[PDB]
Each structure stands twice: as structure tokens, then as C-alpha cells.
Design a protein around this ligand. Structure first.
Ligand code: HEC
Length: 391
């Protein structure tokens, strides 16, 4: 019968296959769970989940970066979302058209507005001594900033906020008093986007992103309404929650760790580096890719789904020594909280400006604050949560 199946017949070379059984791993898990499962099961840079359709999970910084940077091997095809699912020359064309609206210089141009927004909002609840940080401050703050950058009329903020919240709460028990719910939130967004395209088509506006797309060409022809609506939908879906939840996880840490709060308070020059360290620490996205050939990443088969969890890349101890430590003075922080390769976040400079500015204005008006029940170990904030801060 068989012997030494470990060894290639005839030549006898030892198989270099990744060493592990599949696990029944749920991709909808928290970063701490990704890291625990990875620690127990990763073999040669990956582990495999048999759950559902099944998928590979890469587990090293080097491997995850390499996959992000090799679109031919790790495809973004899924279903058409501009620009997330576009590749190659056409994707670069979309990014070229979009670039001017999201440059570092434009983020700086918008920072006085962002700052006025934060200061206005925080000043309005400083007398209360408490706030639900994300529901009442961070989410409408971030959405207001997004609407300013993309050109959605600010009179529509309450509407778009209600859609956003209905999406976040889509797995909660239904609330029959709500005008938007799990089933209607996305169609409501699509209808809003269609109305917005019609508004700007009837009356184009200088410096308005939607109005500019009417003159855009891609692949040598005018942009279609379908692609225009897709793009606007993606900007809404992409441009709020990750920023909000990075803001909330960072402020929750400072509320619980007086030494780090005092550093942030007394040392303005460290604040940009602190934002980058929190971006590393609180990363939780797991972008997926489709393996286009056998042996992708050395483990995947053609047609396999491969996840690239930032919670693993940004905690790789070969790159980030003592990775669980929040260290504002961390000497080497090449984190990929915004991804890497061609699809690297369009909004990274804007998100950085929003987070830093909000925390700056927060500490000007609320220098000292805490969590209300300090007998609870503060959880990682994601999905539906309520971050109460008191002062
Ligand atoms: C101003 C809008 C905007 C904001 C704000 C924003 N994003 Fe993005 N992000 C995008 C868009 C649009 C893309 C898709 C880019 C592409 O596919 O070429 C993207 C892509 C990404 C990707 C790459 C996904 C992949 O499949 O490769 C990551 C990671 C990411 N964003 C993380 C973040 C994080 C973390 C934050 C907040 C700290 C954030 N983004 C804030 C618009 C935004």
C-alpha cells in the first residue's frame, strides 16, 4: 500500500504543503478571535476554514501584503461595485478621476471645516457630562464630513444618518416604529443616489463630485448612470463606519488608560503617531480575494476565497514587536490599516484628518473623562454597540 505519502514519488522531495486541518471558523468574528484561531491553527502563513463555502485565511504581514499587491493572482471580482470590484487599467482610470477629490492637500483644505464641525458638536453636549460617543457625536460628525467631500446637501444628513443606522442595526430585533429597516435601507440609499444624480443633472454645481462625473470618460466612453450610481453608493457605504469605529475604539482606550490619555492631552506633537498606532491596533476589516490559479499564496486552489485580515497583518510580531501593546512611540509602524496595492483606501488621508481633528477638539473641551462602569473590561467596539463616556 502507500508509504511516505509525504514524499513526491520518483524524486522523493518532501511536500511543502501548509500543515493543518480545516477548522469550522466563522469569518464574522472579532479581531481577537482571528488572532487566537491563527495562533492555534495557522500553518506556513495560513489556516483554512471549512465553514460554509469554505475559505483560506492568510495570517502573516508579508503574505497578506503580497496578496494585496498581486491582483492577477488574488482577484477582486465577486456583482459590480465601483471601484472595489474593478481591476487593471480600468480601475486605475477610476482612481485617476477620483484622486483630486481625496488628496492629502484636499484633506488639509477641509480640515478647518472638519474642526468647526467637531467643535460645534462637542460644545453642544459638554454641559451634559455624558454622551453616547458614536450615536450622538462620531457618526453624524463623520457623515457630515463625508457629505461635504462628496457633495451631498447637508439638509439630508438626518435622512442619510437614519439609513446608515438601519444598516448597522440590521441584525437586531426589528423595531416596527422605524421608517428604515434591514430590508429597506439599501433600496432607500439607491433611491437617494438616483435622486441626487437627477438633481445635479438638472442643475450642475461647480466643485461637486457628481456634477463632475457627467464629463468623465472611462474606457474611452462616458461614464454610465449605472456606474455613477454604483460609485456614489460605494462612497456612502465605505465612508462612515470604519472611521466612526476607529474613533470610538481609540477614545474608549484613552477613557480607560489614564497614562495614555495624559500623554495625548499634554503632548500635541505625538497625536499623529498616536492616531497611526490606534489605526494599527483597532484594525478589523478582512478584505476578500478570489484565487485565480492553483497554488495562490502557496496554499489556495483556483476559485478559492482568500481573506486578508488586517487584524492579523497589523499584529504580526515579526513586524510589530509586542503587537498587543498600544505604544504611541512605536518605532516601526508600517501598518496596513488602509490596505495596500491598487485598492488601498481612497479616503485614508480624509479619515486620518477626521480622527485626529475630532480627538484634538475633544481634549480641548473634555480633557478628562472616563467610562461609567469601570468594573467591566471594555470590549472591542464593532457592529451594534453603545459607547457611553462621562465627565
Ligand atoms: C472618503 C471615503 C472613505 C473613507 C472616509 C474611508 N474609506 Fe476606505 N475606501 C474607500 C473607497 C472608495 C475604497 C475602495 C478603493 C478601491 O477599491 O480602489 C476603500 C477601500 C478601503 C480598503 C481596501 C479594501 C480592499 O478590498 O482592498 C481598506 C482596508 C479601507 N478602505 C479601510 C478604511 C479605514 C480603516 C477607514 C477609516 C479609518 C476608511 N477606509 C475610511 C473610501 C473611504
Amino acid at each position: 500500500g502507500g508509504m511516505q505519502a509525504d514524499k513526491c514519488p520518483v524524486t522523493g522531495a518532501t511536500a511543502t504543503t501548509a500543515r493543518g486541518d480545516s477548522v469550522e471558523f466563522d469569518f464574522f468574528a472579532a479581531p481577537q478571535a482571528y488572532r487566537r484561531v491563527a495562533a492555534e491553527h495557522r500553518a506556513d502563513g495560513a489556516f483554512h476554514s471549512s465553514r460554509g463555502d469554505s475559505f483560506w485565511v492568510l495570517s502573516t504581514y508579508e503574505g497578506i501584503c503580497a496578496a494585496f499587491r498581486d491582483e492577477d493572482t488574488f482577484s477582486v471580482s465577486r456583482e459590480r461595485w465601483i471601484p472595489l470590484t474593478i481591476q487593471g487599467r480600468t480601475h486605475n482610470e477610476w482612481r485617476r478621476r477620483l484622486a483630486a477629490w481625496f488628496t492629502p492637500q484636499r484633506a488639509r483644505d477641509l480640515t478647518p471645516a472638519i474642526r468647526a464641525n467637531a467643535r460645534r458638536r462637542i460644545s453642544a453636549f459638554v454641559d451634559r457630562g455624558e454622551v453616547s460617543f458614536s450615536d450622538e457625536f462620531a457618526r453624524p460628525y463623520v457623515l457630515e464630513n463625508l457629505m461635504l467631500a462628496v457633495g451631498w446637501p447637508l439638509a439630508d444628513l438626518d435622512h442619510l444618518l437614519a439609513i446608515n443606522v438601519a444598516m448597522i442595526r440590521s441584525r437586531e430585533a426589528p423595531d416596527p416604529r422605524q421608517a428604515f429597516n434591514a430590508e429597506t435601507a439599501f433600496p432607500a440609499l439607491q433611491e437617494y443616489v438616483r435622486r441626487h444624480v437627477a438633481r445635479r443633472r438638472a442643475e450642475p454645481v461647480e466643485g461637486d463630485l457628481t456634477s463632475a462625473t457627467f464629463d468623465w470618460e472611462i474606457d474611452g466612453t462616458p461614464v454610465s448612470d449605472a456606474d455613477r450610481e454604483s460609485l456614489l453608493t460605494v462612497l456612502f457605504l465605505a465612508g462612515v463606519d470604519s472611521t466612526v469605529n476607529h474613533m470610538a475604539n481609540g477614545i474608549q482606550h484613552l477613557a480607560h488608560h489614564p497614562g495614555d490619555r495624559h500623554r495625548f492631552l499634554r503632548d500635541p506633537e505625538v497625536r499623529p503617531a498616536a492616531v497611526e498606532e490606534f489605526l494599527r491596533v483597532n484594525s478589523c476589516m478582512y478584505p476578500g480575494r478570489l484565487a485565480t490559479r492553483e497554488g495562490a499564496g502557496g496554499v489556495a486552489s483556483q476559485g478559492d476565497t482568500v481573506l486578508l485580515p488586517l487584524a492579523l497583518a497589523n499584529y504580526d510580531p515579526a513586524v510589530f514587536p509586542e503587537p498587543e501593546r498600544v505604544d504611541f512611540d512605536r518605532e516601526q509602524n508600517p501598518h496596513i490599516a488602509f490596505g495596500t496595492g491598487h485598492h488601498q483606501c481612497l479616503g485614508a488621508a480624509y479619515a486620518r484628518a477626521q480622527i485626529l481633528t475630532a480627538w484634538e477638539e475633544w481634549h480641548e473641551l473634555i480633557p478628562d473623562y472616563r467610562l461609567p462602569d469601570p468594573t467591566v473590561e471594555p470590549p472591542f467596539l464593532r457592529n451594534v454597540y453603545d459607547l457611553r463616556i462621562v465627565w
